[PDB]
Design a protein around this ligand. Structure first.
Ligand SMILES: CCCCCCCCCCC(CCCCCCCCCC)(CO[C@H]1O[C@@H](CO)[C@H](O[C@@H]2O[C@@H](CO)[C@H](O)[C@@H](O)[C@@H]2O)[C@@H](O)[C@@H]1O)CO[C@H]1O[C@@H](CO)[C@H](O[C@@H]2O[C@@H](CO)[C@H](O)[C@@H](O)[C@@H]2O)[C@@H](O)[C@H]1O
Ligand SMILES: CCCCCCCCCCC(CCCCCCCCCC)(CO[C@H]1O[C@@H](CO)[C@H](O[C@@H]2O[C@@H](CO)[C@H](O)[C@@H](O)[C@@H]2O)[C@@H](O)[C@@H]1O)CO[C@H]1O[C@@H](CO)[C@H](O[C@@H]2O[C@@H](CO)[C@H](O)[C@@H](O)[C@@H]2O)[C@@H](O)[C@H]1O
Ligand SMILES: CCCCCCCCCCCCCCCCCC(=O)OC[C@H](COP(=O)([O-])OCC[N+](C)(C)C)OC(=O)CCCCCCCCCCCCCCCCC
Ligand SMILES: CCCCCCCCCCCCCCCCCC(=O)OC[C@H](COP(=O)([O-])OCC[N+](C)(C)C)OC(=O)CCCCCCCCCCCCCCCCC
Ligand SMILES: CCCCCCCCCCCCCCCCCC(=O)OC[C@H](COP(=O)([O-])OCC[N+](C)(C)C)OC(=O)CCCCCCCCCCCCCCCCC
Ligand SMILES: CCCCCCCCCCCCCCCCCC(=O)OC[C@H](COP(=O)(O)OCCN)OC(=O)CCCCCCCCCCCCCCCCC
Ligand SMILES: CCCCCCCCCCCCCCCCCC(=O)OC[C@H](COP(=O)(O)OCCN)OC(=O)CCCCCCCCCCCCCCCCC
Ligand SMILES: CCCCCCCCCCCCCCCCCC(=O)OC[C@H](COP(=O)(O)OCCN)OC(=O)CCCCCCCCCCCCCCCCC
Ligand SMILES: CCCCCCCCCCCCCCCCCC(=O)OC[C@H](COP(=O)(O)OCCN)OC(=O)CCCCCCCCCCCCCCCCC
Ligand SMILES: CCCCCCCCCCCCCCCCCC(=O)OC[C@H](COP(=O)(O)OCCN)OC(=O)CCCCCCCCCCCCCCCCC
Ligand SMILES: CCCCCCCCCCCCCCCCCC(=O)OC[C@H](COP(=O)(O)OCCN)OC(=O)CCCCCCCCCCCCCCCCC
Lengths: 670, 494, 81, 74, 75
């Protein structure tokens, strides 16, 4: 069964992709969805075997790379973290395969799309089940290749080509740092299997831990889209919608978070990497939360809300709170996928429009979509007793519960991020459903009200809801968004919970803050997020549909105009990256090709030699006049020169200088 | 008769049959190409037989023949682990290169086949000779056939390309020859089992290193000595390009394991920083210029320069994993560059008659089979895991990092830039819009021939990317013998 | 509507709106192939997995029904008194 | 509504069949046949790797120390 | 045009002319203050910098089996 989880999504993928002509559209969907659903059941069974009974399972098949000290196997370890990661990844992948049956029903390339969907699932599973750093790197690149293919799926569109390059290259920047960190682990410990690294971590040189830790933090930044290496993820919204929900919101964006949690036994022995994790997460929270409020596309708002939640996880990891980081990762994957799939319902309902400025109404047109989108939003803003409430809010008080200046500072930072999460959460639901219709007649024109005379049987298109495959995943994910956090907090948090005693997560006792978080945090700062959430929601809802001119007054101020543009333009990072990094590299290549390789290297090389030596050859040949009297004088002068050189005991250096001089003169014509 | 002599003899027989069969039957040129292809298959079958019998942990040369008839220049043949895989690469590549030109060679077909068959014998003899001066003789012997191959079958700029590769290689080689002749004078021979026991004094090693290095940097090539490759690898016929990039670039790498590591250990260790600066510069400069190269075959040719920099840095690492990774990368480069040259110089070029990138776009729409293999090959060029290219790049890069960290860190940036030019070139050709509006006719997809040379090459890189033990197991023991150094509590046991 | 496309382009994944008339029959064979390979993988896993703690007798641990390591332990532990 | 799977594999039009260029025999039967045979032959090749020989001596030496249990005690 | 008959291509003269300029550009390189400065920077300065840094850090560090109570520095 444990191997059968690994290979089953791969088997479906090769049938969907390399034999699509045999099974067709329906055969491809039946095989992939079947092969993912069966894998999901085995994952639920695995979560009970490994996690609840605390029986880790080791499996090694054949060696991969064997050189002296490095022995890397095709080997898999199931531990409490492994089965914890597999639950969101397999369930959401099963619900996104099903959702795609309806969503892409009119696309001409269903077989290839479902092959990509199942191949991504297999690479994600490899990434979390591998028992060594390098095999994880295979799934790390595996999900990156699958992400590039799925972002560029509609490959005749130029902008989706640019986005796919951005995701491939930006992640490769983080791959380069992950490779050096693996090189540093190999150099210090002799190989990279997890057990070896984690058994020797307390004893290795503290500077070595920093080098490895910083290296794997930078790789985590790219895959989890933190402020340094974040720009790819918003651009990844160019793929089809079920890709955004599965790959860029719920599972692959969490690989960086998984890397740090799996590395917790090592990075616990480096406060430097923990402190850098702590601030990097906080920056990412406010950075994206600010940007998302000023986005005009619904998928772009949701993408920046993913970036802000992933920052909350990295923030939590910086407080040595990997269990709370894992709890938020699992919980966020459920309700954030719900928002993406609910958004996909809207985009389908209004003929692919994605701009808030053309929504409005739809509240009576998409009641089921509105309900689950509202349910998901309250989970995102950590409304009390929702699923997201149990994870996010604990992260906040844990930041305060670590009574340190950095911990207090991140609390304030992440609180402001929470404020703007509420703001753009209000912005989505209101501009889509609650506001007046800013879109055209076609969206809202119903057959109940008579408008046409002869084109009455058809020609209404009233922006209705989707079919069963479109709506069933919404209902399921809605239920997880309400009860799953409450049902499961005692596992992931507990108070002295021993779910991760296989050492999947290591928390050094000196890094414990949970006691102070439960008892030492004042009640005012515990409920402060809810006071802010329940008020800025009132402030946001009042500013629209009641005021609606004040924000306009702000926009048309030069201060507000500049503020609006700066945040809409994502702190101008894409502008400055393109100007001074991408175009810098292209111009370096232009110089190298033009001034050196097709330039100076040719002239101080073969081409210059050809020019000069042909000239030298022709000038020397000019002396050969065939005048017998001239050759006679030439013999005579040569005779005298030989006599001089030997008679006067001349310095040999003089003779060589004379020869060089003669070539100089024959360089010059006439 | 030794099996190693059979390896060198079979292609000469095929040359004889090709040149005489007109007297036993206007013979169709299909018959000629059938003879040459079967000739390469038998040579491959013999190399497979040798490998089945080959022993992975012997420090004696295997399959050697006693001479007992010593002359001034006697060809001694022998094989060990550090040469066995280059012999296999040569005997696998040669049939694929023949099939890749099955239709595109339209005139002078007999001359083309005889040159390729002669190239097979000469390149194999380079890997099998047990004498350092024999190595130079085979290394330089391939130049006149290569000059003729380019000049009889090359594209519009074939004359300038043929001259460049001949004069660059000759010039570098003349400095290697002076280094070899000095060795021959001090030791009395260049036979491996005698010269490897000699201990040259340090200043002699330094001036021996220079002269061997000048030649190997011309042949790697390092950036700045690489315009012959940017000409010859592009102007060459497709079969010439495959042989030139898959096997001929590997000569300088196998040459380092015979001519520098065992006999110049002190000069090699003291000069590694000069080697690493050149290798680091080559990795960045070649990568940036590959990004701006608009000839599709020139872009695949320039990426060979960047990959060869990494195996060159791995070969000077003086670590087991760096040395094994260098051989692994050399082999993986041979399968990947062969496939990318087939994709560009054989599939795009035959269909369009042009090599300019500006005319290609959206080929996936009409050529799905080409785009599938082309993409997998572009992942191999980017060193994606599950290809043998990742295993070689990782091991080479780890050894370079451990030997000299700043050089490895710069060399590691190849993981970013090889992806950049591979993905950029893939996107512009297969993706990047609908089918190019410059195409008047529609294009057919891969023919069965094109499919099965790409599939075979893609098969080798992926199978060895998942189980690289198939090469490493036969590398470990012999490659131990070229490492230089000691551990304090492990050395001088009593 | 549905986009037009060339009928001469052969693609292994099907092409544009590809569904053969016999798609159920073909899907049945491939699903059978998938089951057969999966079962072989299942047999390998149930023999080569390694554990260091065994499950308690009264706990829901279905692998106890096929994994060689646990099956041997349970059979040996039944020999008591 | 779905379309019937179309397309010309190897560019062979539906009326005609594939024509052999002359390379197919040697390549499929000689080149690929020999590689398949070699792979079967390689299953029966004895292990001559330095690792296999060195693992056995390493096991005995760690049996000598208090690391590995001795199947044949004294 | 090149051996085997290829498909009809709308060979755009401007693009063809650009391709010809790139093949022949070596014939028109000249030494100027700009070209000499660029060539000197790429060929001498940057390589000698990496060479100097590689020289000065050769043998400086070793990671293998370094524990707490030890230094990465060797020299
Ligand atoms: C992604 C990077 C993220 C950030 C990384 C930060 C890592 C921080 C560690 C930096 C590090 C590791 C480099 C290993 C690299 C291995 C491969 C690279 C990675 C492979 C994956 C580089 O340190 C080297 O730097 C050299 C110069 O650069 C210096 O050598 C020379 O410097 C000049 C003459 O002195 C010459 O001019 C230069 O020619 C020479 O060479 C040396 O300082 C040293 O060799 C080691 O730093 C160490 O410095 C020393 C002195 O403080 C510290 O000792 C302290 O001494 C006591 C009193 O002094 C203190 O009371 C006490 O506290 C402590 O005992 C150490 O504790 C440690 O701090
Ligand atoms: C560029 C590649 C050189 C080709 C390989 C050379 C092969 C070895 C010749 C190097 C050479 C001159 C080098 C002069 C500068 C080289 C050209 C300058 C730049 C050219 C544009 C070293 O000559 C030096 O050898 C040293 C001892 O090794 C002595 O100390 C020196 O005094 C002596 O000058 C000649 O010595 C050689 O002869 C033998 C006699 O039996 C010596 O024993 C060795 O000495 C041997 O090496
Ligand atoms: C240590 C090594 C470091 C080297 C640093 C400098 C790098 C220079 C590399 C020189 C080795 C390659 C030279 C290639 C020259 C070929 C060429 O120019 O085109 C031939 C050309 C091809 O050029 P073409 O094809 O573009 O046009 C000419 C047309 N035909 C051929 C009909 C005339 O063919 C010729 O025969 C004409 C050449 C006339 C004489 C030119 C001789 C120059 C050779 C210099 C060698 C000197 C070495 C001394 C050092
Ligand atoms: C790393 C080297 C490769 C190793 C893995 C080798 C493949 C293993 C199996 C992969 C899963 C199965 C893939 C099915 C193919 C996808 C659908 C298809 O047939 O494409 C044809 C399709 C045909 O599509 P179509 O069926 O929709 O036909 C109509 C579409 N047009 C208009 C194009 C004709 O061609 C394409 O459209 C895309 C061209 C690129 C194909 C992308 C390659 C897919 C395989 C990716 C390899 C994954 C590597 C993993 C990363 C390494 C890990 C670190
Ligand atoms: C590689 C192309 C030619 C072969 C193509 C067909 C095979 C491709 C792989 C398909 C899967 C085959 C194995 C399936 C798994 C079953 C395991 C198994 O077969 O056990 C038997 C063996 C493992 O048996 P074993 O591990 O118990 O012991 C035998 C191994 N020695 C000799 C070391 C002791 O696996 C194989 O033999 C598979 C052979 C693969 C192909 C041969 C090696 C690659 C080609 C060599 C050329 C490399 C140089 C290239 C130029 C440089
Ligand atoms: C794809 C899966 C292929 C089936 C692999 C399992 C078959 C097997 O048991 O072979 C194992 C064999 C011996 O195992 P070994 O590599 O020596 O070391 C074991 C360390 N865990 O080692 C081997 O020979 C495995 C060879 C793997 C070749 C994979 C080729 C994949 C082609 C697609
Ligand atoms: C708050 C502190 C701001 C200090 C004031 C700085 C300032 O003077 O900026 C003025 C600038 C005016 O905008 P401008 O387009 O130049 O007006 C045209 C008039 N003809 O207006 C601005 O530039 C405001 C800048 C807004 C974007 C800055 C980035 C976000 C800042 C977060 C706070
Ligand atoms: C190695 C570095 C050399 C590479 C080329 C460097 C170079 O700059 O070559 C150009 C040089 C002059 O070429 P130029 O005359 O300006 O072009 C024709 C204009 N109508 O071309 C030349 O003329 C250089 C001539 C060099 C001749 C060398 C002769 C060797 C004999 C050495 C004798 C020692 C005593
Ligand atoms: C060692 C073995 C011998 C070396 C190779 C010599 C081969 C000579 C036997 C070929 C005899 C022959 O008949 O060749 C004919 C062929 C062109 O003639 P043909 O086919 O009749 O023209 C038809 C026009 N419609 O002409 C050819 O095929 C010859 C093709 C050129 C020969 C190879 C390219 C030159 C290589 C360098 C030659 C000089 C150095 C020798 C290298 C040997 C290896 C180091
Ligand atoms: C779909 C949604 C799934 C979400 C999964 C999320 C994982 C975390 C959820 C946490 C919930 C914990 C499980 C709740 C029920 C636990 C339980 O005790 O159920 C009882 C059942 C029998 O257990 P037993 O020990 O034999 O009781 C008698 C002892 N004398 O114990 C069981 O084993 C019943 C559970 C069967 C597990 C297989 C379910 C396949 C579907
Ligand atoms: C479909 C069919 C495709 C082709 C099938 C062949 C593919 C084979 C690939 C693997 C080969 C394995 C077979 C093998 O192991 O042969 C061993 C053979 C017998 O060994 P032995 O008698 O001891 O000779 C020792 C000489 N030193 O070793 C040998 O000595 C064989 C000698 C062969 C000599 C060849 C002579 C030139 C052939 C033309």
């Amino acid at each position: 069964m444990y191997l059968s989880i690994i290979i089953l999504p791969l088997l479906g993928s090769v049938v969907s992709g390399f034999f699509g002509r045999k099974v067709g559209v329906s055969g491809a969907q039946l095989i992939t969805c079947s092969s993912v659903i069966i894998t999901t059941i085995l994952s639920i069974i695995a979560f009970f075997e490994v996690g609840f009974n605390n029986i880790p399972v080791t499996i090694n098949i054949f060696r991969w790379i064997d050189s002296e000290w490095f022995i890397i196997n095709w080997g898999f370890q199931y531990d409490s973290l492994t089965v914890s990661m597999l639950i969101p990844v397999l369930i959401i992948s099963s619900l996104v395969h099903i959702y795609s049956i309806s969503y892409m029903s009119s696309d001409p390339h269903n077989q290839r799309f479902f092959s990509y969907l199942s191949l991504f699932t297999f690479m994600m599973i490899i990434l979390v089940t591998a028992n060594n750093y390098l095999l994880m790197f295979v799934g790390w690149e595996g999900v990156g290749v699958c992400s590039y293919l799925l972002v560029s799926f509609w490959f005749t569109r130029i902008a989706a080509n640019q986005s796919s390059i951005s995701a491939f290259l930006t992640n490769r920047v983080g791959d380069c740092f992950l490779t050096v960190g693996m090189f540093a682990i190999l150099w210090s410990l002799g190989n990279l299997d997890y057990a070896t690294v984690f058994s020797l971590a307390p004893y290795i040189n503290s500077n070595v831990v920093i080098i490895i830790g910083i290296c794997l933090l930078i790789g985590a930044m790219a895959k989890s889209s933190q402020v340094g290496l974040h720009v790819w993820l918003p651009m990844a919204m160019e793929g089809p919608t079920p890709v955004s929900a599965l790959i860029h919101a719920a599972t692959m964006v969490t690989a960086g978070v998984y890397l740090l949690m799996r590395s917790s036994p090592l990075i616990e022995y480096s406060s430097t990497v923990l402190l850098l994790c702590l601030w990097l997460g906080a920056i990412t929270t406010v950075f994206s939360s600010l940007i998302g409020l000023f986005q005009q596309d619904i998928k772009k708002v949701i993408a920046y809300s993913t970036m802000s939640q992933l920052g909350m996880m990295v923030l939590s990891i910086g407080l040595s709170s990997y269990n709370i980081a894992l709890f938020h990762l699992v919980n966020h994957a459920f309700y954030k996928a719900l928002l993406f799939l609910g958004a996909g319902s809207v985009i389908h309902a209004v003929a692919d429009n994605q701009d808030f400025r053309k929504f409005g109404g739809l509240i009576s047109y998409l009641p089921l979509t509105y309900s689950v989108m509202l349910i998901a939003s309250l989970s995102l803003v950590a409304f009390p007793f929702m699923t997201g409430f149990y994870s996010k809010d604990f992260i906040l008080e844990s930041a305060y519960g670590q009574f340190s200046f950095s911990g207090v500072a991140v609390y304030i930072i992440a609180t402001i991020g929470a404020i703007f999460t509420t703001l753009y959460s209000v912005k989505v639901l209101y501009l889509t459903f609650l506001s007046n219709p800013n879109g055209p007649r076609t969206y809202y024109r119903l057959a109940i009200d008579n408008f046409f005379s002869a084109q009455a049987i058809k020609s209404y298109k009233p922006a209705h809801e989707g079919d069963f495959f479109l709506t069933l995943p919404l209902v399921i994910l809605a239920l997880f968004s309400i009860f799953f956090g409450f049902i499961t907090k005692d596992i992931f948090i507990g108070l002295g919970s021993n779910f991760f005693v296989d050492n999947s997560l290591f928390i050094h006792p000196i890094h414990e803050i949970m006691i102070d978080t439960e008892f030492a945090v004042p009640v005012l700062f515990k409920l402060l997020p809810f006071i802010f959430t329940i008020s800025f929601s009132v402030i946001a809802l009042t500013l629209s549909e009641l005021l609606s001119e004040l924000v306009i007054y702000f926009k048309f101020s030069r201060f507000g105009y500049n503020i609006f543009g700066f945040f809409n333009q994502r702190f101008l990072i894409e502008f400055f990256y393109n100007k001074y990094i991408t175009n810098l590299i292209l111009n370096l290549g232009g110089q190298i090709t033009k001034i050196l390789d097709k330039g100076s290297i040719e002239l101080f090389g073969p081409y210059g030699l050809e020019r000069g030596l042909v000239k030298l050859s022709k000038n020397i040949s000019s002396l050969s006049t065939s005048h017998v009297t001239t050759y006679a004088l030439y013999i005579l002068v040569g005779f005298i020169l030989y006599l001089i050189y030997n008679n006067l005991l001349l310095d040999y250096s003089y003779l060589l200088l004379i020869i060089i001089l003669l070539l100089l003169l024959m360089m010059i014509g006439e | 008769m030794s099996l190693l002599y059979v390896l060198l003899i079979i292609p000469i027989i095929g040359i004889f049959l090709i040149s005489t069969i007109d007297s036993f039957y206007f013979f169709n040129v299909s018959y000629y190409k059938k003879i040459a292809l079967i000739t390469t298959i038998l040579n491959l079958i013999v190399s497979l037989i040798i490998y089945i019998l080959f022993d992975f942990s012997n420090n004696q040369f295997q399959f050697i023949q006693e001479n007992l008839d010593l002359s001034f220049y006697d060809i001694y043949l022998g094989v060990d682990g550090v040469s066995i895989y280059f012999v296999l690469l040569t005997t696998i590549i040669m049939p694929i290169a023949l099939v890749s030109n099955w239709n595109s060679i339209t005139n002078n077909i007999k001359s083309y086949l005889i040159i390729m068959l002669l190239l097979e014998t000469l390149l194999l003899a380079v890997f099998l000779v047990l004498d350092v001066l024999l190595f130079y003789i085979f290394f330089e012997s391939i130049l006149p056939p290569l000059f003729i191959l380019i000049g009889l079958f090359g594209s519009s700029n074939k004359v300038r390309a043929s001259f460049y590769i001949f004069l660059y290689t000759l010039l570098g080689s003349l400095f290697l020859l002076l280094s070899i002749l000095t060795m021959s004078s001090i030791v009395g021979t260049t036979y491996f089992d005698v010269l490897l026991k000699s201990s040259f004094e340090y200043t002699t090693q330094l001036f021996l290193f220079f002269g061997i290095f000048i030649a190997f940097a011309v042949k790697t090539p390092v950036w700045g000595l690489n315009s012959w490759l940017l000409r010859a690898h592009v102007e060459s016929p497709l079969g010439g390009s495959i042989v030139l990039a898959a096997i001929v670039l590997k000569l300088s790498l196998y040459g380092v394991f015979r001519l520098i590591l065992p006999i110049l250990p002190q000069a090699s260790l003291n000069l590694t920083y000069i080697v690493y600066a050149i290798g680091a510069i080559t990795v960045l400069y070649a990568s940036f210029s590959t990004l701006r190269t608009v000839d599709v075959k020139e872009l695949i040719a320039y990426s060979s320069v960047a990959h060869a920099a990494i195996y060159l840095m791995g070969v000077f690492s003086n670590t087991i994993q760096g040395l094994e990774g260098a051989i692994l990368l050399g082999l993986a480069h041979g399968f990947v560059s062969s496939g990318l040259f087939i994709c560009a110089g054989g599939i795009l070029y035959d269909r369009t008659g042009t090599r300019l990138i500006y005319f290609f776009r959206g080929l996936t729409q009409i050529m799905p089979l080409f785009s599938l293999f082309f993409f997998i090959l572009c992942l191999g060029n980017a060193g994606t895991p599950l290809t043998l290219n990742f295993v070689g790049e990782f091991m080479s890069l780890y050894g370079t990092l451990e030997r000299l960290p700043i050089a490895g860190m710069l060399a590691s940036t190849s993981i970013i830039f090889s992806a950049a030019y591979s993905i950029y070139m893939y996107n512009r050709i297969a993706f990047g819009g609908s089918v190019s509006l410059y195409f008047i006719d529609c294009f057919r997809d891969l023919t069965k021939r094109e499919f099965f040379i790409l599939f075979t090459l893609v098969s080798f890189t992926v199978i060895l990317g998942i189980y690289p033990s198939f090469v490493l197991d036969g590398l470990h023991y012999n490659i131990s013998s070229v490492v230089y150094g000691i551990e304090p509590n492990a050395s001088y046991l009593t | 509507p549905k986009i037009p496309y060339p009928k001469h382009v052969w693609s292994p994944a099907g092409g544009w709106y590809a569904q053969p008339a016999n798609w159920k029959q073909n899907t049945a064979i491939f699903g059978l192939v998938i089951f057969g390979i999966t079962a072989m993988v299942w047999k390998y896993s149930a023999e080569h997995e390694v554990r260091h703690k065994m499950p308690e007798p009264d706990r829901f641990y279905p692998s106890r029904y096929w994994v060689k390591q646990i099956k041997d332990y349970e059979r040996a532990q039944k020999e008591k008194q | 509504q779905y379309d019937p799977p179309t397309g010309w594999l190897w560019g062979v039009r539906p009326g005609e069949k594939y024509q052999n260029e002359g390379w197919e025999g040697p390549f499929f039967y000689g080149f690929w046949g020999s590689l398949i045979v070699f792979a079967i032959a390689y299953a029966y090749k004895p292990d001559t790797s330095i690792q296999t020989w060195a693992l056995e001596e390493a096991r005995r030496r760690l049996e000598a120390e208090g690391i590995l249990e001795d199947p044949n005690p004294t | 045009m090149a051996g085997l008959q290829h498909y009809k291509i709308a060979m755009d003269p401007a693009l063809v002319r650009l391709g010809s300029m790139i093949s022949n550009r070596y014939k028109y390189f000249r030494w100027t203050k700009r070209t000499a400065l660029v060539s000197f920077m790429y060929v001498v300065v940057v390589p000698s910098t990496i060479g100097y840094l590689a020289y000065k850090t050769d043998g400086l560090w070793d990671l293998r089996a370094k524990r707490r109570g030890d230094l990465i520095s060797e020299r």
